[PDB]
Amino acid sequence: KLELRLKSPVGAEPAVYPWPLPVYDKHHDAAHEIIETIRWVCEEIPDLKLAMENYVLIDYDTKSFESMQRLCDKYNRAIDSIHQLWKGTTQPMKLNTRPSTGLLRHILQQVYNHSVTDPEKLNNETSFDLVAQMIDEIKMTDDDLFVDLGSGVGQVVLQVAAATNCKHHYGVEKADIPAKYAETMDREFRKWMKWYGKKHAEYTLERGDFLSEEWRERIANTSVIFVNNFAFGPEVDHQLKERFANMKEGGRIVSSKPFAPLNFRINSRNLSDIGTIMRVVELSPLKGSVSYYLHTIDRTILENYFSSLKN
Numbered sequence: 001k002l003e004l005r006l007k008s009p010v011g012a013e014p015a016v017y018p019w020p021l022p023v024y025d026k027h028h029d030a031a032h033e034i035i036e037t038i039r040w041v042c043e044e045i046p047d048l049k050l051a052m053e054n055y056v057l058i059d060y061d062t063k064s065f066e067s068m069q070r071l072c073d074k075y076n077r078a079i080d081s082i083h084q085l086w087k088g089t090t091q092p093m094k095l096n097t098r099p100s101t102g103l104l105r106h107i108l109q110q111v112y113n114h115s116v117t118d119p120e121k122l123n124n125e126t127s128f129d130l131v132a133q134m135i136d137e138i139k140m141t142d143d144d145l146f147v148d149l150g151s152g153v154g155q156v157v158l159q160v161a162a163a164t165n166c167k168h169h170y171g172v173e174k175a176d177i178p179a180k181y182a183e184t185m186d187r188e189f190r191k192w193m194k195w196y197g198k199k200h201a202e203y204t205l206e207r208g209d210f211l212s213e214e215w216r217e218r219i220a221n222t223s224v225i226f227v228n229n230f231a232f233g234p235e236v237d238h239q240l241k242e243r244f245a246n247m248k249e250g251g252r253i254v255s256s257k258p259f260a261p262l263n264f265r266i267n268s269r270n271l272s273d274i275g276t277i278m279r280v281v282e283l284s285p286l287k288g289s290v291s292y293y294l295h296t297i298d299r300t301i302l303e304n305y306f307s308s309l310k311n
């Protein structure tokens, strides 16, 4: 039990890593998780950054236990010192805050790397930045209800719940492997958010089938749906159209394949198509990453067709 330990900046249980430090995949290992965690805690707390300014931006040897041990001791002592500074007159750091996008990206990486330990069993990454663009574009409020349809190991739900104020966030997933992993991710996410002292809106990861009778009314009372439908066959896409027809006004759907055409002009031969009750717009892709679509339930376009004929 050689070990490295990192103290929480808010008194939660320390993160404990074994030595030699594990490798996650060809591009991520525990050594760098540690270094990046330290650096993010220095951004969280400016005094900490000052206290180890002469240590945080030097490229330690991640293969020497002593070099890594020196980094963690330097950090752990600085934390002890900050916790004393807060005991005095100096006020602590706020505990109600949401994590910045950078920090959240780092947390979700370590949560994933700690939860999904054999990513071969998920055979049968860059989703974070795409989801982040969408979070910036699709404004959400404490009124809204969020769902990720086919939520996987849950990371997109975790991202949105950490970023927005919605009253609730849901993921729904039918396969047992990803649902198993989702339970761990949930566990880890709560651990590390506590560890960093950061807030999240409420969320739930469920096992279930979003095309079932139970989910019909749930979809109808959902105001924000994300669905990566790029590989759904036409049966499933037709099933979802049926579900979305019952959505309240203003309800939003963001997808990769559109559920109604952009050009849709309403006429007598198509007046029952879903295109009659929703605006559709193509959303800008991220330079580095391809088409995404925003559907907003607007029944007034049906109204304007009936008002027009009535003239």
Ligand SMILES: CC(C)N(CCCNC(=O)Nc1ccc(C(C)(C)C)cc1)C[C@H]1O[C@@H](n2ccc3c(N)ncnc32)[C@H](O)[C@@H]1O
Pocket (backbone or CB within 6 Å): 127, 130, 131, 134, 148, 149, 150, 151, 152, 153, 154, 155, 156, 172, 173, 174, 175, 178, 208, 209, 210, 211, 226, 227, 228, 229, 254, 255, 256, 292
């Ligand atoms: C590809 C989709 C469908 N899904 C993605 C899992 C991670 N979530 C995710 O990528 N969300 C997301 C990401 C980006 C976007 C945008 C690009 C911004 C539009 C939108 C959504 C895969 C999971 O859906 C599950 N799924 C598929 C059908 C099925 C079912 N009817 N009920 C239950 N779960 C089911 C399937 O078992 C997979 O675990």
